[PDB]
């Protein structure tokens, strides 16, 4: 009657972005670049991968 099942799940995902499929791995090496980028992305993403 609506099929709003997969739409709700998958969508919210991209919004919070997938759980992986990005770059490769992080490591203490960056310096000239800003540290606010790696902190947010790496954190917000890996930490958001959780689902109660």
């Amino acid at each position: 009657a609506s099929y709003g099942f997969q739409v709700a799940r998958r969508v919210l995902n991209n919004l919070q972005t997938n759980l992986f499929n990005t770059s490769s791995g992080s490591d203490k090496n960056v310096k000239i670049h800003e540290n606010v980028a790696p902190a947010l992305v790496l954190s917000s993403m890996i930490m958001s991968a959780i689902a109660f």
Partner: protein
Amino acid sequence: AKTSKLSKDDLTCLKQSTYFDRREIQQWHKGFLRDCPSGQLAREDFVKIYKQFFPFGSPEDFANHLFTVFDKDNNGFIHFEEFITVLSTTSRGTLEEKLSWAFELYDLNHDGYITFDEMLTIVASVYKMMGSMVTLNEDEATPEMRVKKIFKLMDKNEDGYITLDEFREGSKVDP
């Protein structure tokens, strides 16, 4: 001469709830001073955060909104207070705070009410970002449709815009 500000109003605000162990709060902060000594994160910078971790397509649009939202004050500049606050909710929350935070994002005008025009804007953003949107093939289509269906699915009152109240319900109805 150069201190670090917010080194007292924050720790104090805690003393109770804290989605970031003491040694953490002051942690991101220091990272902030780096990105900006004046404790001010402008769109340009934010845009670089995503454009750097996702050069694939053009997540830009998503960076303009996510940034405008991350700022509760929406003054054009994101201060540490707003940043950290999200760094936490974005992760843990122990509450439907997730549905609420999302509402703010789905409402550019953040006028407490979302608008078909706004919903599309975002949806369109997440569309021009990753490739998964391609596998979607099975049913669904351009964003214009996704939204038209959503509203008609999350809004049986047909009022052009929806409120956090109805937004929450329409959501809890997915399961």
